[PDB]
Amino acid sequence: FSTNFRDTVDILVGSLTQQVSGWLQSLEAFSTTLLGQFLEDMEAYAEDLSSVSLPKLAALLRVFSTVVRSIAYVTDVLYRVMRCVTAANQVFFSEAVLTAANECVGVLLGSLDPSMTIHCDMVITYGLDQLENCQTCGTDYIISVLNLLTLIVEQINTKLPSSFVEKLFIPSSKLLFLRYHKEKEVVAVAHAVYQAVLSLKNIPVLETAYKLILGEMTCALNNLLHSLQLPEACSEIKHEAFKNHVFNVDNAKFVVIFDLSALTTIGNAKNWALSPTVFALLSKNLMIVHSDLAVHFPAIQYAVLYTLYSHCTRHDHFISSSTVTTATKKHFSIILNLLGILLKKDNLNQDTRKLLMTWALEAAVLMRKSETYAPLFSLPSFHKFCKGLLA
Amino acid sequence: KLLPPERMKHSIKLVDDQMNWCDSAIEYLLDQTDVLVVGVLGLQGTGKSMVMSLLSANTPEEDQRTYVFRAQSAEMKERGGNQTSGIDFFITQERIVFLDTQPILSPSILDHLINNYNLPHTYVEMQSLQIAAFLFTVCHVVIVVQDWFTDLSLYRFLQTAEMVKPSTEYYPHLVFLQNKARREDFCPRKLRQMHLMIDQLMAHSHLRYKGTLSMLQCNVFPGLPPDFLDSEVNLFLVPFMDPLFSLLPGYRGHPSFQSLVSKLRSQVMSMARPQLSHTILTEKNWFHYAARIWDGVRKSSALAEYSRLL
Amino acid sequence: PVSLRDLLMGEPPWREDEICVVGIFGKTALRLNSEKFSLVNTVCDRQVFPLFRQDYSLLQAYYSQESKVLYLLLTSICDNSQLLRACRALQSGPHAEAHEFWKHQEKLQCLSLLYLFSVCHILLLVHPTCSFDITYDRVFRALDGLRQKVLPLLKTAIKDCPVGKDWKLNCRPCPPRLLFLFQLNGALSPKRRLQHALEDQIYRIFRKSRVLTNQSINCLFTVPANQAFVYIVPGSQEEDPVGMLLDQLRSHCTFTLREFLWQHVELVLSKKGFDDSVGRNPQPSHFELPTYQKWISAASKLYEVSKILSSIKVLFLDIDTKFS
Ligand SMILES: Nc1ncnc2c1ncn2[C@@H]1O[C@H](COP(=O)(O)OP(=O)(O)OP(=O)(O)O)[C@@H](O)[C@H]1O
Numbered sequence A: 001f002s003t004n005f006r007d008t009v010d011i012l013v014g015s016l017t018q019q020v021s022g023w024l025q026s027l028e029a030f031s032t033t034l035l036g037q038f039l040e041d042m043e044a045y046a047e048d049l050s051s052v053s054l055p056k057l058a059a060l061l062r063v064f065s066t067v068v069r070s071i072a073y074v075t076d077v078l079y080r081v082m083r084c085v086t087a088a089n090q091v092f093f094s095e096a097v098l099t100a101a102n103e104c105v106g107v108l109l110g111s112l113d114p115s116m117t118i119h120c121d122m123v124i125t126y127g128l129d130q131l132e133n134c135q136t137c138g139t140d141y142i143i144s145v146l147n148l149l150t151l152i153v154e155q156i157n158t159k160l161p162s163s164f165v166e167k168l169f170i171p172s173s174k175l176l177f178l179r180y181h182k183e184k185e186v187v188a189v190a191h192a193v194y195q196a197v198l199s200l201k202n203i204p205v206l207e208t209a210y211k212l213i214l215g216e217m218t219c220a221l222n223n224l225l226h227s228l229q230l231p232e233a234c235s236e237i238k239h240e241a242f243k244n245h246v247f248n249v250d251n252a253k254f255v256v257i258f259d260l261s262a263l264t265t266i267g268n269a270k271n272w273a274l275s276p277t278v279f280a281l282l283s284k285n286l287m288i289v290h291s292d293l294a295v296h297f298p299a300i301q302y303a304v305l306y307t308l309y310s311h312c313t314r315h316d317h318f319i320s321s322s323t324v325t326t327a328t329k330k331h332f333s334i335i336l337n338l339l340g341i342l343l344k345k346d347n348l349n350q351d352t353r354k355l356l357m358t359w360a361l362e363a364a365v366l367m368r369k370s371e372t373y374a375p376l377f378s379l380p381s382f383h384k385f386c387k388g389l390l391a
Numbered sequence B: 001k002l003l004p005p006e007r008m009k010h011s012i013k014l015v016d017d018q019m020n021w022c023d024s025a026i027e028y029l030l031d032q033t034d035v036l037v038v039g040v041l042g043l044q045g046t047g048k049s050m051v052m053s054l055l056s057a058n059t060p061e062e063d064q065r066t067y068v069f070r071a072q073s074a075e076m077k078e079r080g081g082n083q084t085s086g087i088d089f090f091i092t093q094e095r096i097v098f099l100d101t102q103p104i105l106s107p108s109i110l111d112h113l114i115n116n117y118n119l120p121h122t123y124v125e126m127q128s129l130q131i132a133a134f135l136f137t138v139c140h141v142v143i144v145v146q147d148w149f150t151d152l153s154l155y156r157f158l159q160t161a162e163m164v165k166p167s168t169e170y171y172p173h174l175v176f177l178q179n180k181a182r183r184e185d186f187c188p189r190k191l192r193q194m195h196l197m198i199d200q201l202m203a204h205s206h207l208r209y210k211g212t213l214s215m216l217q218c219n220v221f222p223g224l225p226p227d228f229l230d231s232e233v234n235l236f237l238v239p240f241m242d243p244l245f246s247l248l249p250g251y252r253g254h255p256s257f258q259s260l261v262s263k264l265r266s267q268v269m270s271m272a273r274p275q276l277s278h279t280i281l282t283e284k285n286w287f288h289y290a291a292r293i294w295d296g297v298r299k300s301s302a303l304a305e306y307s308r309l310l
Numbered sequence C: 001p002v003s004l005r006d007l008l009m010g011e012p013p014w015r016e017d018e019i020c021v022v023g024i025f026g027k028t029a030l031r032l033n034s035e036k037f038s039l040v041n042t043v044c045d046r047q048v049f050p051l052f053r054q055d056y057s058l059l060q061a062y063y064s065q066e067s068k069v070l071y072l073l074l075t076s077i078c079d080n081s082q083l084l085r086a087c088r089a090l091q092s093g094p095h096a097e098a099h100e101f102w103k104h105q106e107k108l109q110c111l112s113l114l115y116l117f118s119v120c121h122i123l124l125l126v127h128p129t130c131s132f133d134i135t136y137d138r139v140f141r142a143l144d145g146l147r148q149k150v151l152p153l154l155k156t157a158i159k160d161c162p163v164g165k166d167w168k169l170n171c172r173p174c175p176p177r178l179l180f181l182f183q184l185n186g187a188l189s190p191k192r193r194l195q196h197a198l199e200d201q202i203y204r205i206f207r208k209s210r211v212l213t214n215q216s217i218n219c220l221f222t223v224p225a226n227q228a229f230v231y232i233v234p235g236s237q238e239e240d241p242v243g244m245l246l247d248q249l250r251s252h253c254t255f256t257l258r259e260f261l262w263q264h265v266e267l268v269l270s271k272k273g274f275d276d277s278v279g280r281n282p283q284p285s286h287f288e289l290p291t292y293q294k295w296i297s298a299a300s301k302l303y304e305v306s307k308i309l310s311s312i313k314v315l316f317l318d319i320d321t322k323f324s
C-alpha cells in the first residue's frame, strides 16, 4: 500500500480527476515525509519561473489538497510556505493556480481550530490582494475568493482588526460590486460573507460594520426619495462614507432589499447590544416607507414588515416581558399600535394586507391562550388594534 | 308563457374555416334591441380563447376541458399548432354577443397552407386584414391581447386594417390586454412608460383608445393618484395562472388572477353600446347586417388594390 | 464592451489571431436585463456587461481572448430600450412628420442589419416568445435584393485590402449561418419535440418564400442540414433580482447555450467551414479565417460607407404610403 499510492498520484498528476480523488480518499507517518516532495517541487518551480509550468502547479496543488483531505506545529510553517510560493508567481496571473491555491489554503486553515495565535497579517493581506483584483474574473474564481474570505473571517474570531472590516464595507470595496452577479451562487456566497462578518462576538469590530450597512441603506432610501421628488429623511443613521453618491432606482431597491435580508443574521439571533436596535430600526427609524414609498415601491415595505414579523415571532411577540426583560417591557404595545395604524389605512397592497392579517390573527389567538394576559385588554393599543380589525 | 328561448351550452361556428358564412345562429336570437358585441384579436399563443371563455360563461376554478371556446391542449403546444379556426359565436344570458377569432399571421396556418396569389404568403395577411376590418365594422368593442409588451408590429397592422376597412364615421373602442403579466409589469414607473408608449404610438389612430376602461379607478392601485399619469389609456393586465408564519405564501406583487378577471368582466359588461348604422337594429337585424357586411368585404375593391401592391 | 465606431479608429497583444465574428440581433421586451447582455454574459461565463448600467441605432463590439471570438450586438427601434427613448423624445420634441420619422428609423435599422449581414461569420436572432413572427420572412426578402444593388459599390471600397480573393468577390468571408433563439415565456422531452417542430416550420416557410435555395452562394444565409439551429431558453429565477432576493430572504427566515454555440464555432475555428447544399449537385463554398488586423482592415472600410443613401431610398411603411 505504501507504493500503491504512487501510481495513483502519478496518474492523477497528469474530468476524470474526481474518480481518482474519491478512490484515493476512500482508500485510507509516510504522508509527513511525502508532502516534502511536493513542497520542494513547488518551491523549485517558483524559483525557476523568475510559462508552461502552470498546469503542473495546478495539478500538484489539486493532488496535495486531495491527499490532505483524505485524512500540530508545522501547520503554520507549511501554510506560510504555500502562501509565499503562491504570491511569488505574480507575473503569469493564472486563474487555475490561484483557485487551486485558494482551495488548498482554505482546507489547510480549516483543518486546525480557532484556538491559537497563528500569523494573520499574511492571510489578511493575501485575501485583500486577491479581492482587490477579482472584478472581471471567472464564475469559479469569484466563488473561491468569497469562500476563502468567509473561512478566514470565521477562523479569526475576535482578533480581526477594525481596519479589516472598515475597508470591506466601503463604496470603493469590490465586495459591494460582486453581489450584482446574475448567478445565484455568487449572491449566496456574498450573503454568507455578510452573515459571517455580522456573526462576530466582538462588539467594537461589529459596530462599524453595522453603521456602514445602515449608512448604505439610508443613502439608497434618500436617493429613492429624491428621485420621487420628496425630501430626504433618516438623517439620524447617516454615515460620512456615503456623503455624496448616486444610486439608480433599481440599484437602490436591490441594495435596500439585500441589506434587509442580510440583517436577519442578527435579527433572528437566539441570544448584541448595539445603539439602534433592530426592532426600533424596523419599527420607528424606517417609518417613511409607509408614507409614500409604499405606493411606488411596495417591495421595500413588504420586506421590512416580513423581517419584523420574523424577528418578533421568534420571541412570542414579547408577551412575557409585557436586563433583556426590562429592555423589552414596551414591545407588545408598539407592535399592537403599528398593526392598528397599518390596518386602518386604505392604501395597502394585497400581499401586505394578507401578511398583516396573518400577524393579527396569530397575535389574537395568542392573546386568550393564557389566563394571565387579562390585564393586556385595557391598554389603548388593544383598542386601536380592535378598531383596525373591525375597519 | 314567458320562458326564455333557449340556453347555449357550447359556442358555434359563425364562419367556416374556408371563409364561408354559416347561418346557424338565428335559432338563439330574439327580436330585442340594445345588443352588445365584443370581439378579440391577438397572436397565436396570446390566449384569446381562454380570455373569451372566462369572460362569457366560465370561471377560473372550472376546468379547461369544458370551456365554451376550445383552448389549446398540451399535445398541441409541443407541435406548435393553432386551435381556433374561423370565427366563433356565443351569446350569454344577458344578451351579450361574444365573437372569437383565429390567430393573425400565425405560422401554424401558413404551414398548414404550404401543403395545399403569387406566393402562399400574402393570403394569410389578407385573411387577417379581412377579419380585423370585419370586427372593426360590426362589433361594439375589440380587445387586443398581447403576449409580450411592445410587439411594434401590431400597431402598424391595426392602422393598415382600419385604413382598408369597408366603411359620420363609426370607430369601435379598442382595448389593450397584456396577458401573462409579471411583477415587474405591475409598477407605477413601468405603467407610466407603458401608457406613454401606447399614446405616442397611436396618435392618429382615430379609434377610441382612451377615456374609458381606466384600471386606475378599479382599485388596482390603492395609493396611485390619477394625475400621476399624463393620459391613462384603456390598458389592462392579466397575470399568469395562480405556527402561522411558516405557512405564509410567496410574494407575487400583483393582485389575484380571479380578482382581475372579475374586474375585467365587470368593466367589459358595463361598457357603452353606441349605434352602428343610421337606424336602430335588433338581434336578428344585427345578424343580417353582419352577414351583408361580410359578403361585401369578401368581394371588395380596396383589398384588390392592396393585393396588387404586394 | 465599447462602441463599434470607437473601436475601428484604434491591438499589439492580439495583432494576428484567428477569430470568429458572431452577430446578435432581434427584438427585446421592456425589461431591466436585456436578452442580448445576459446571453453574452452566459456565453463568456463572465460579467461582460455589468448590471444596473437624431438616430436610434447602435452597434456594440466585444472581444474575448479566452475564446478568440468577437461579438457584435445590434440595437435599433425593435428593442424597447430605444423605442422608449424615441417615444419620449417625440412626446416633447402632424400625421406626415411621424410617418417620415418612422420610415427613416426603419431605413436606418435596415441599413445596419445589412451591414451586419456581410461582416459576420455566425449570426443569431432572438425573440421573446416561442412562436416566431412570419414578418421576418418578408424583411429578409426585402434585404437580399438590397445587397444585390449595393454589392458592386461595396467591392469597390475594399479593393485595396489584404482580405483575399473570395472576400473581394462576395464581399463576405463566407456564407453566414443564422441561428434562432426563443424563450419559453411560461409555455409547457417536450422541449425536443417543440424544437424539432419549430425547425421544420421555419425551414418550410423559408423554402417556400424562396429565401433559402439549394446553392449556398446566392442566398444571404443558410441553416444546418443535420445539426440543431433552434434553442429555447427555459425559465429561471435569474430575471427580476427583487424576486430572487425575496425568495432568499424567505428561505433564510425559515444541451446548453454554451455547447449549442461551440458546436458551430468549432467548425469555423478549425478552418473546415460550412457546407449546406442538397440540390443534387453541391458546389464548394468560399471560406476564410482572417486575423484581428486583417478583419479590421475591411471592417473599417465597410463601416465608413455616396450612392448608398440613393439605393436605400428605393426600397415597411412604403406600401402604406403608396396606398394612402
Ligand atoms: N394567463 C395565462 N396564464 C397561464 N396560462 C395561460 C394563460 N392564458 C393562456 N394560457 C394557456 O396558454 C395557452 C394559450 O392558448 P389559448 O387556448 O388560451 O388561446 P390562444 O393562444 O388565443 O389560441 P389560438 O392558437 O387558437 O390563437 C393555453 O394552453 C392556455 O391554457
Ligand SMILES: [Mg+2]
Pocket (backbone or CB within 6 Å): B048, B049, B050, B070, B071, B072, B083, B084
Ligand atoms: Mg384559440
